[PDB]
RNA sequence: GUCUACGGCCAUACCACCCUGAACGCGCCCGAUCUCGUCUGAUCUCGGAAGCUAAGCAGGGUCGGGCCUGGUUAGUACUUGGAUGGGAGACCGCCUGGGAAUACCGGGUGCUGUAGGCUU
RNA sequence: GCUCAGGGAGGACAGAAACCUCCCGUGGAGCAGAAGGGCAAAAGCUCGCUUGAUCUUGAUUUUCAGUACGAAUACAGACCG
RNA sequence: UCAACCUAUUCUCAAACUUUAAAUGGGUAAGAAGCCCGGCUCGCUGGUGUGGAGCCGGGCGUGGAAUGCGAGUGCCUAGUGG
């Protein structure tokens, strides 16, 4: 029996989390985050679309795997079973309440922990998608259809960014190719020039 | 040729035997490594209790000594030769300290006593370098840096080199 | 039968009615609180 | 009035609407009219403005 | 493997001592006690004894705290002892107590109220402490620093305090630390601290290595040997030292020198030359590759 | 209600600042202050006898007594109406000087000495501080180029 | 140029490794009769000078970690004051002012007081 | 006078865990308690000696009405450790 | 292989976490009770007619940011405390 998310929507409270202090938090919902083709290296995905958010609201736990499904399923459908990475860039840890009646009333009110929730701001990512370069628009379509289980108003924007990387899409193959970026799975680690050079020549050999 | 600083010499050698009882064979423990070394011991308490073992908090269950220079030369040449000049590649710590553990104390040369019985003891031999005084003094505390330390190869093949010993791997 | 329990709300207007006066600026404040073997020492000083 | 801007008011002599008054500028003087600036309209007067 | 414990998170929340406590020289809770004056005393000065006993030579300093550092105002080392007859043995009780009467009595010549507060002329070995006399400037009191030697009895630290006592500095002090104050009988006999003040001590075990054998008096006693001290030189020549010290007290300072300025250790290399030399081992690296490959 | 400790609340004013913990420096011992000097409050942790209480932590205050280790100073504090001038006893190390009176005298041993000079040559110095005037009229030298024209880059929404 | 003794500010001084130290020093070092203290002269204390820069320490090096200090992030985030501004709300824009921090990229790596040596 | 939690490497029975040694170890331990601050030749641990946990008049802080009690802070007069 | 581990990386947080760290704000100061000299007293402090403090005596007025305005003080006191 949980309340419908427009009663805890709203960023009405502060970050309250999971903590010494607030013990007998109920299990989250969602704990799978990123899925898809995971162990897959940042050369054979060049494309990412991220759900971002347009409203400073309270995404709960419950809508985000609601999501999490309805984007997985989508794309297991359409770009075959492990040509994608979903990620979810929110991890839930304010931890919302409940007065519960049923005669005392308002006297001793403080709720007992029921759900968690994300707190979101204006263009902070939601979920995120490292597909192919003509897997396009079955990010944009998967995106789309993933919108429709969260509350408000959400966009959806296909970024310069090569995959889950810091790094721009039209830099990525140069700086790897001279040899600062170097590959290591789910993503890329950078490389200075202000290390020991042992680390230089162990890379240049 | 090499700078006469630099000599592998034993800093100390440290006995003990952990008796893990209190009171008789403890004491009479402290009179075996008395008479072994001439000098009187100090007994070593315990620091917690655990009762799968049969001691107590502050309970008097080890003797131990540690011996300098010359008396420290013999003795650790008698147990050497209870063991044959001969240890395993395993004794040696990374600080280059090396040491065993002998059986029985009438192996030594220290005469039986039916008042005394037999007891095991540990040796322990610190090495050490001219120089390894500055991390343990007092009005100028330093540490000692890496070319002066004892390596554990460098401290082995002193030990082969000074007893002639053997020492096996595994 | 609740009642509002704390307020600091018209006291800052009742305070600057009459003003906050700052303390009283005088010459020659006095000495008692000073350190009594020098307050000692100075009334010999001027005894003499 | 907040109380701030009252004061700043009252030492630049405007008490009722519609007064008006001459003030030399400076860096004290500009941050005094900017603090009361929402409650006037200040300007720079021609000779014949005088 | 293991957890690395020296790692970015350490060092950047490491916080370092003192600089002085770093390398250990001073201890800062005794500093703290022994210089900070009542904060009614306003700028009046806090004199301290300094004793340090090095390998070779004794230091004594006198020495009152101000904010840009510790002002010294008389120093008296042991290496100066020849001047006044002392040949060498310069860092035992004796020669402890000489420079001890050394700085006492330069720096009293030094405020010029050496003819007045003489101190014990003759050296007894008792308890003393010199009285400031009335209508004649007050006798200097400086409170002693040993700093991190365990002050345990016959000291040469306390060898010092005991010169300066006798040389008229007022410093308080208890005979408890003396050579001579036995530990189980509870009392302080003169004569066998005199004896530590005249280096009996020394003289008694230079007869009893010539007795009993004399390799190792070779080996112990040697610069004694090349400057001849014998143990009957020993008493008059402290006592030729004590006198000798207190006739003519005052310091002659070593001219300077024109220095040639050599260049004796290696200059701090510029970030032109450390980055030349990061390009020629980054270029000779690619070279040694290619044309091994 | 709160309760009413005499060190509510002061997790962060007593504490001391991060990677400055350990011994006190021995300057903050070695000051001398008169009385009439004036005085700033900062308590510290490290030392526990003769705290300023958290009512005083950056107040300012006048020296009326110095004591062996201590001092006594007269602080104003504003209690609901009124404001108090009081005499608390405050250790040694919790106290700077004010800078505030230092530049003060500066500017006062300048303008006597200034005084004191062309007083005898006979022109007119200034010596109040009238405060940063408008700006005199100057030219501005674009020497050679045009200047650089600017424009409003357009929306790209990075995010 | 440099060191010792006492320091001040307490990393621009720390930490890891390597190289070099002439003279004076500081050391390591050799001993235990006496002072002293220990299971043990390792420490502390005491008496010395046969030897050695090996260590400490000093100076220097590392496309070093750190630290210090600039740029970037950014006039971004935030924010005093204002509107009968927008929006159903959430929140956002604007005017008047003030204005940060990471990541990322450069520079630096102890200054210095008092007393006394050395560099015949 | 010593350095703590923790970890590494050695050592007869000994082990995951008794005890001995070496090395790293900015507090990750301890300080009676609840938490927060604070602390490394100490405020921690172990010793030695002890009774300033004593007699006494004032001032001041703290909640405050700028009143009490409690608690605390500099002093001052002895008598001591 | 799968693990713990360990080493650089990465995603998301904190009212009762924090290296950094604003805006608003909180004290103090912006002189005549201040400066600069000459000198006496003290049982306090004292190497030192030292240090500090107090007292006399003299000389300094460009009244030492802007802006505004006559101020300080003492009784008695209703009402109020939803
Ligand atoms: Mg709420
Ligand atoms: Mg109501
Ligand atoms: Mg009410
Ligand atoms: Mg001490
Ligand atoms: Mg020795
Ligand atoms: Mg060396
Ligand atoms: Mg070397
Ligand atoms: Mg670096
Ligand atoms: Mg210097
Ligand atoms: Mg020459
Ligand atoms: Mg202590
Ligand atoms: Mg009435």
Redesign the interface.
């Known amino acids: 029996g949980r309340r419908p998310a427009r009663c805890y929507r709203y960023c009405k409270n502060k970050p309250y989390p999971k903590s010494r202090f607030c013990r007998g938090v109920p299990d989250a919902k969602i704990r799978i985050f990123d899925l898809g083709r995971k162990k897959a290296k940042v050369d054979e995905f060049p494309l990412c679309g991220h759900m971002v958010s347009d409203e400073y609201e309270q995404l709960s736990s419950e809508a985000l795997e609601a999501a999490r499904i309805c984007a997985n399923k989508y794309m297991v459908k359409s770009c075959g079973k492990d040509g994608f990475h979903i990620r979810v860039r929110l991890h839930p840890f304010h931890v919302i309440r409940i007065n519960k009646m049923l005669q005392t009333g308002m006297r001793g009110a403080f709720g007992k922990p029921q759900g968690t929730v994300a707190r979101v701001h204006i263009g902070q990512v939601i979920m995120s998608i490292r597909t192919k370069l003509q897997n396009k628009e079955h990010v944009v379509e998967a995106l789309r259809r993933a919108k429709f289980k969260f509350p408000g108003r959400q966009k959806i924007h296909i970024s310069k960014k090569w995959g889950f990387t810091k790094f721009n899409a039209d830099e990525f193959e140069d700086m790897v190719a001279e040899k600062r970026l170097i590959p290591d799975g789910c993503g890329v680690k950078y490389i200075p020039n202000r290390g020991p050079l042992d680390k230089w020549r162990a890379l240049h050999s | 040729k090499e700078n006469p600083m630099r000599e592998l010499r034993i800093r100390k050698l440290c006995l003990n035997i952990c008796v893990g009882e209190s009171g008789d064979r403890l004491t009479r423990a402290a009179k075996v490594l008395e008479q072994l070394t001439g000098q009187t011991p100090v007994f070593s308490k315990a620091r917690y209790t655990v009762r799968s073992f049969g001691i107590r908090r502050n309970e008097k269950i080890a003797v131990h000594c540690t011996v300098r220079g010359a008396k420290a030369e013999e003795i650790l040449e008698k147990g050497l030769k209870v063991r044959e000049y001969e240890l395993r590649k395993n004794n040696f710590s990374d600080t280059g300290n090396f040491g065993f553990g002998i059986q029985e104390h009438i192996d030594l040369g220290i005469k039986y006593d039916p008042s005394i019985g037999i007891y095991g003891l540990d040796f322990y031999v610190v090495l050490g370098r001219p120089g390894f005084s500055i991390a343990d003094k007092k009005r100028r505390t330093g540490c000692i840096g890496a070319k002066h330390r004892i390596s554990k190869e460098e401290a082995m093949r002193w030990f082969q080199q000074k007893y002639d010993g053997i020492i096996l791997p595994g | 039968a609740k009642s509002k329990n704390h307020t600091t709300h018209n006291?800052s207007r009742?305070?600057?009615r009459?003003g906050?006066?700052?303390?009283?600026s005088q010459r020659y404040?006095s000495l008692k609180?000073?350190?009594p073997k020098?307050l000692r020492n100075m009334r010999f000083a001027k005894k003499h | 009035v907040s109380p701030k801007v009252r004061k700043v008011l009252q030492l630049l002599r405007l008490r009722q609407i519609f007064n008006g008054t001459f003030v030399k500028l400076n860096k004290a003087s500009i941050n005094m009219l900017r603090i009361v600036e929402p409650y006037i309209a200040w300007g720079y007067p021609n000779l014949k403005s005088v | 493997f293991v957890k690395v414990v020296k790692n970015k998170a350490y060092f950047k929340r490491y916080q370092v001592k003192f600089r002085r406590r770093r390398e250990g020289k001073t201890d800062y809770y005794a500093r703290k006690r022994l210089v900070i004056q009542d904060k009614n005393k306003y700028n009046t000065p806090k004199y301290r004894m300094i004793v340090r006993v090095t390998n070779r030579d004794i230091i004594c300093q006198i020495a009152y705290a101000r904010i840009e550092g510790d002002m010294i105002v008389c120093a008296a080392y042991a290496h100066e002892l020849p001047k006044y007859g002392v040949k060498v043995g310069l860092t035992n009780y004796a020669a402890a107590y000489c420079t001890g009467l050394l700085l006492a009595r330069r720096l009293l010549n030094r405020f010029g109220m050496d003819k007045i507060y003489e101190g014990q002329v003759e050296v007894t070995g008792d308890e003393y402490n010199v009285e400031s006399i009335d209508g004649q400037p007050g006798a200097f009191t400086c409170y002693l620093d040993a700093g991190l030697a365990r002050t345990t009895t016959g000291n040469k630290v306390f060898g010092a305090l005991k010169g300066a006592v006798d040389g008229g500095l007022s410093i308080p002090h208890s005979t408890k630390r003396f050579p001579g104050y036995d530990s189980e009988s509870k009392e302080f006999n003169a004569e066998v601290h005199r004896k530590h003040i005249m280096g009996q001590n020394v003289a008694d075990y230079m007869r009893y290595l010539m007795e009993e054998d004399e390799d190792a008096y070779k080996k112990q006693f040697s610069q004694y040997i090349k400057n001849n001290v014998t143990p009957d030189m020993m008493e008059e020549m402290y006592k030729k030292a004590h006198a000798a010290i207190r006739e003519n007290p005052v310091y002659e300072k070593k001219p300077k020198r024109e220095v040639k300025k050599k260049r004796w250790n290696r200059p701090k290399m510029s970030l032109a030359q450390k980055k030349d030399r990061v390009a020629q081992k980054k270029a000779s690296f690619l070279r040694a590759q290619e044309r091994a490959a | 209600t709160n309760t009413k400790g005499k060190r509510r609340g002061t997790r962060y004013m007593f504490s001391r600042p991060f990677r400055k913990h350990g011994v006190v420096p021995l300057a903050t011992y070695m000051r001398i202050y008169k009385k009439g000097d004036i005085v700033d409050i900062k308590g510290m942790g490290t030392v526990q006898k003769g705290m300023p209480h958290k009512c005083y932590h950056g107040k300012t205050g006048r020296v009326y007594n110095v004591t062996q280790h201590a001092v006594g100073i007269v602080v104003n504090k504003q209690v609901k109406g009124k404001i108090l001038a009081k005499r608390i006893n405050v250790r040694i190390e919790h106290i700077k000087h004010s800078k505030s009176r230092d530049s003060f005298l500066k500017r006062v041993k300048e303008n006597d000495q200034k005084k004191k000079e062309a007083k005898e040559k006979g022109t007119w110095v200034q010596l109040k501080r009238q405060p940063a005037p408008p700006r005199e009229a100057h030219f501005v030298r674009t020497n050679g180029k045009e200047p650089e024209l600017l424009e409003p880059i357009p929306y790209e929404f990075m995010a």
């Open positions: 006291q009742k305070w600057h009459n906050i006066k700052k303390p009283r404040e609180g000073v350190d020098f």
